[PDB]
Design an enzyme around this catalytic site. Structure first.
Site, PDB file in Angstrom:
ATOM      1  N   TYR A  77      31.986  40.003  49.110  1.00  0.00           N
ATOM      2  CA  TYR A  77      32.843  41.085  49.595  1.00  0.00           C
ATOM      3  C   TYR A  77      34.174  40.469  49.969  1.00  0.00           C
ATOM      4  O   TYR A  77      34.220  39.504  50.730  1.00  0.00           O
ATOM      5  CB  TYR A  77      32.217  41.781  50.812  1.00  0.00           C
ATOM      6  CG  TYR A  77      30.989  42.584  50.454  1.00  0.00           C
ATOM      7  CD1 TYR A  77      31.103  43.869  49.926  1.00  0.00           C
ATOM      8  CD2 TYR A  77      29.722  42.014  50.529  1.00  0.00           C
ATOM      9  CE1 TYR A  77      29.990  44.560  49.471  1.00  0.00           C
ATOM     10  CE2 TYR A  77      28.606  42.691  50.076  1.00  0.00           C
ATOM     11  CZ  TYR A  77      28.744  43.962  49.544  1.00  0.00           C
ATOM     12  OH  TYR A  77      27.628  44.601  49.062  1.00  0.00           O
ATOM     13  N   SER A  78      35.251  41.014  49.414  1.00  0.00           N
ATOM     14  CA  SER A  78      36.604  40.523  49.677  1.00  0.00           C
ATOM     15  C   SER A  78      36.986  40.822  51.129  1.00  0.00           C
ATOM     16  O   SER A  78      36.819  41.952  51.592  1.00  0.00           O
ATOM     17  CB  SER A  78      37.599  41.209  48.728  1.00  0.00           C
ATOM     18  OG  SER A  78      37.171  41.146  47.379  1.00  0.00           O
ATOM     19  N   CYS A 254      42.890  43.529  41.673  1.00  0.00           N
ATOM     20  CA  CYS A 254      41.542  43.522  42.243  1.00  0.00           C
ATOM     21  C   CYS A 254      40.902  44.900  42.354  1.00  0.00           C
ATOM     22  O   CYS A 254      41.544  45.862  42.765  1.00  0.00           O
ATOM     23  CB  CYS A 254      41.564  42.868  43.630  1.00  0.00           C
ATOM     24  SG  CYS A 254      39.916  42.518  44.323  1.00  0.00           S
ATOM     25  N   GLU A 294      40.651  39.598  39.875  1.00  0.00           N
ATOM     26  CA  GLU A 294      39.372  39.577  40.577  1.00  0.00           C
ATOM     27  C   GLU A 294      38.752  40.977  40.494  1.00  0.00           C
ATOM     28  O   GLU A 294      38.811  41.756  41.451  1.00  0.00           O
ATOM     29  CB  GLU A 294      39.583  39.185  42.046  1.00  0.00           C
ATOM     30  CG  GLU A 294      38.306  39.077  42.875  1.00  0.00           C
ATOM     31  CD  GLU A 294      37.666  37.692  42.832  1.00  0.00           C
ATOM     32  OE1 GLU A 294      37.026  37.351  41.813  1.00  0.00           O
ATOM     33  OE2 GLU A 294      37.812  36.944  43.824  1.00  0.00           O
ATOM     34  N   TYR A 296      35.383  43.550  39.591  1.00  0.00           N
ATOM     35  CA  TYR A 296      33.933  43.626  39.605  1.00  0.00           C
ATOM     36  C   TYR A 296      33.480  45.043  39.252  1.00  0.00           C
ATOM     37  O   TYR A 296      32.756  45.675  40.042  1.00  0.00           O
ATOM     38  CB  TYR A 296      33.416  43.213  40.993  1.00  0.00           C
ATOM     39  CG  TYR A 296      34.199  43.803  42.153  1.00  0.00           C
ATOM     40  CD1 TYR A 296      33.755  44.939  42.824  1.00  0.00           C
ATOM     41  CD2 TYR A 296      35.398  43.228  42.569  1.00  0.00           C
ATOM     42  CE1 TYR A 296      34.481  45.486  43.880  1.00  0.00           C
ATOM     43  CE2 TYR A 296      36.133  43.771  43.621  1.00  0.00           C
ATOM     44  CZ  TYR A 296      35.666  44.898  44.267  1.00  0.00           C
ATOM     45  OH  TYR A 296      36.405  45.445  45.282  1.00  0.00           O
TER      46      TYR A 296
HETATM   47  C1  LIG Z   1      34.668  38.636  44.156  1.00  0.00           C
HETATM   48  C2  LIG Z   1      33.976  39.964  44.496  1.00  0.00           C
HETATM   49  C3  LIG Z   1      34.530  40.753  45.511  1.00  0.00           C
HETATM   50  C4  LIG Z   1      33.947  41.998  45.911  1.00  0.00           C
HETATM   51  N1  LIG Z   1      34.559  42.734  46.919  1.00  0.00           N
HETATM   52  C5  LIG Z   1      33.974  43.967  47.290  1.00  0.00           C
HETATM   53  C6  LIG Z   1      34.568  44.713  48.353  1.00  0.00           C
HETATM   54  O1  LIG Z   1      35.574  44.346  49.000  1.00  0.00           O
HETATM   55  N2  LIG Z   1      33.945  45.922  48.678  1.00  0.00           N
HETATM   56  C7  LIG Z   1      32.818  46.405  48.013  1.00  0.00           C
HETATM   57  O2  LIG Z   1      32.353  47.524  48.409  1.00  0.00           O
HETATM   58  N3  LIG Z   1      32.227  45.681  47.007  1.00  0.00           N
HETATM   59  C8  LIG Z   1      32.803  44.496  46.668  1.00  0.00           C
HETATM   60  N4  LIG Z   1      32.157  43.678  45.628  1.00  0.00           N
HETATM   61  C9  LIG Z   1      30.961  44.295  45.048  1.00  0.00           C
HETATM   62  C10 LIG Z   1      29.751  43.885  45.799  1.00  0.00           C
HETATM   63  O3  LIG Z   1      29.645  42.368  45.782  1.00  0.00           O
HETATM   64  C11 LIG Z   1      28.633  44.518  45.300  1.00  0.00           C
HETATM   65  O4  LIG Z   1      28.179  44.304  44.002  1.00  0.00           O
HETATM   66  C12 LIG Z   1      27.885  45.628  46.069  1.00  0.00           C
HETATM   67  O5  LIG Z   1      28.319  46.007  47.380  1.00  0.00           O
HETATM   68  C13 LIG Z   1      26.799  46.302  45.329  1.00  0.00           C
HETATM   69  O6  LIG Z   1      25.786  45.185  45.820  1.00  0.00           O
HETATM   70  P1  LIG Z   1      24.463  46.009  46.330  1.00  0.00           P
HETATM   71  O7  LIG Z   1      23.614  44.884  46.961  1.00  0.00           O
HETATM   72  O8  LIG Z   1      24.906  47.386  47.000  1.00  0.00           O
HETATM   73  O9  LIG Z   1      23.312  46.613  45.406  1.00  0.00           O
HETATM   74  P2  LIG Z   1      22.444  46.140  44.192  1.00  0.00           P
HETATM   75  O10 LIG Z   1      21.229  46.220  44.959  1.00  0.00           O
HETATM   76  O11 LIG Z   1      23.006  44.611  43.892  1.00  0.00           O
HETATM   77  O12 LIG Z   1      22.912  47.105  43.076  1.00  0.00           O
HETATM   78  C14 LIG Z   1      23.433  46.573  41.904  1.00  0.00           C
HETATM   79  C15 LIG Z   1      23.454  47.327  40.575  1.00  0.00           C
HETATM   80  O13 LIG Z   1      24.175  48.554  40.698  1.00  0.00           O
HETATM   81  C16 LIG Z   1      24.229  48.975  39.346  1.00  0.00           C
HETATM   82  N5  LIG Z   1      24.912  50.296  39.186  1.00  0.00           N
HETATM   83  C17 LIG Z   1      25.897  50.983  39.887  1.00  0.00           C
HETATM   84  N6  LIG Z   1      26.109  52.222  39.397  1.00  0.00           N
HETATM   85  C18 LIG Z   1      25.177  52.293  38.349  1.00  0.00           C
HETATM   86  C19 LIG Z   1      24.864  53.324  37.422  1.00  0.00           C
HETATM   87  N7  LIG Z   1      25.442  54.557  37.504  1.00  0.00           N
HETATM   88  N8  LIG Z   1      23.908  53.077  36.479  1.00  0.00           N
HETATM   89  C20 LIG Z   1      23.313  51.824  36.407  1.00  0.00           C
HETATM   90  N9  LIG Z   1      23.539  50.801  37.229  1.00  0.00           N
HETATM   91  C21 LIG Z   1      24.518  51.103  38.202  1.00  0.00           C
HETATM   92  C22 LIG Z   1      24.271  47.811  38.441  1.00  0.00           C
HETATM   93  O14 LIG Z   1      22.964  47.801  37.785  1.00  0.00           O
HETATM   94  C23 LIG Z   1      24.334  46.680  39.476  1.00  0.00           C
HETATM   95  O15 LIG Z   1      23.942  45.406  39.087  1.00  0.00           O
HETATM   96  C24 LIG Z   1      32.750  42.455  45.216  1.00  0.00           C
HETATM   97  C25 LIG Z   1      32.225  41.650  44.208  1.00  0.00           C
HETATM   98  C26 LIG Z   1      32.811  40.404  43.808  1.00  0.00           C
HETATM   99  C27 LIG Z   1      32.148  39.621  42.697  1.00  0.00           C
END
Ligand SMILES: Cc1cc2nc3c(=O)[nH]c(=O)nc-3n(C[C@H](O)[C@H](O)[C@@H](O)COP(=O)(O)OP(=O)(O)OC[C@H]3O[C@@H](n4cnc5c(N)ncnc54)[C@H](O)[C@@H]3O)c2cc1C
Length: 296
Positions: A77-78, A254, A294, A296
């Protein structure tokens, strides 16, 4: 090129094996109830133990186990706060998290584990944190640089970080006298994150800060097309291309993955007129540290 502010930059002081355990101090929804989703702003206590810098991320490890009985992997998370933090005491870290709840269209509704974990945090709760992570999105050293920030949704996080240091804080060692241009794309007004903060920055430094909003579902261009980030950029194509060919111009992008091609489409039309290929040109800009992405 101003090879970013990477001097003394610490990377992964805390790892998943033994993370920092911080405490949620505040958690507030910053989107209107009518917005296509909710984004929350949250502050964690760090005790000064996390030496982060603007443009970096931290990892969060959600509580519980996956379907395999194994702890959840960290999600990045940024950081939305500057190095000094929202409290200005260097003891906190802030996040801008979008709650991921999707059914796509219909069927089974699934909630993103970490994002939902974060948005449901209650003040006083503990949270496993790792990092800091990242060097790509570090700010340029040159205090007179032209910084163009292109973001969508939560992609505003590192740019809010940049601007706090630039316009809300006073550093003897950093007095920004260059041009900061922010382009933010969101679907509705109720989704314009930190709008009030950015307009306050505009009052204070009208000649150094340029702010352009793109609300896709409430604005269109002359042709009747929706105002996506790139359609807004298009109304400044001339200026952006001019600025883009100066040695002290850095573009940071980003947010959501989709945004990249849209911007590439616009840049290609501009580059073609001037007789140069954008793919080749973009490559060089990346090499010169002036095109940092950056998504995602
Ligand atoms: C460098 C970087 C910076 C980031 N900064 C931020 C930030 O500032 N704020 C922020 O909110 N997030 C940010 N993220 C995103 C964050 O890391 C996440 O991926 C996140 O919050 C979702 O992780 P999760 O654990 O909720 O759920 P998970 O349990 O990891 O859910 C993941 C899955 O959602 C899926 N998905 C979403 N919509 C659908 C769909 N309609 N159909 C199928 N699959 C779908 C994909 O399969 C994905 O792999 C950043 C990511 C990176 C790499």
């Amino acid at each position: 090129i101003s090879k970013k502010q990477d001097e003394g930059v610490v990377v992964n002081k805390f790892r998943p094996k033994e993370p920092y355990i911080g405490r949620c101090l505040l958690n507030t929804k910053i989107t209107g109830d009518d917005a296509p989703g909710e984004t929350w702003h949250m502050v964690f206590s760090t005790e000064g133990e996390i030496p982060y810098r603007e443009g970096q991320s931290i990892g969060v490890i959600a509580d519980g186990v996956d379907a395999n009985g194994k702890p959840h992997k960290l999600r990045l998370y940024s950081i939305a706060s500057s190095a000094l933090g929202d409290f200005g005491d260097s003891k906190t870290v802030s996040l801008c998290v979008k709650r991921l709840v999707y059914t796509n269209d219909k069927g089974e509704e699934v909630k993103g584990v970490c994002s939902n974990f974060l948005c449901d945090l209650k003040p006083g709760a503990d949270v496993k944190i790792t990092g800091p992570v990242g060097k790509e999105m570090l700010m340029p050293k040159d205090p007179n640089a032209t910084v163009i920030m292109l973001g969508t949704g939560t992609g505003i996080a590192p740019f809010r970080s940049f601007l706090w240091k630039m316009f809300f804080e006073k550093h003897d060692d950093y007095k920004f006298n260059g041009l900061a241009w922010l382009f933010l794309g969101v679907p509705t007004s109720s989704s314009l994150l930190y709008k009030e903060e950015f307009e306050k920055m505009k009052e204070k430094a009208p000649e150094n800060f340029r702010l352009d909003f793109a609300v896709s579902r409430e604005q269109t261009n002359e042709k009747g097309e929706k105002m996506y980030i790139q359609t807004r950029m298009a109304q400044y194509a001339e200026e952006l291309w001019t600025l883009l060919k100066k040695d002290n111009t850095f573009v940071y992008m980003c947010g959501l993955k989709g945004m990249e091609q849209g911007i590439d489409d616009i840049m290609s039309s501009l580059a073609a007129k001037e007789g140069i290929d954008w793919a080749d040109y973009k490559k060089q800009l990346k090499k010169a540290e002036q095109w940092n992405v950056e998504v995602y």
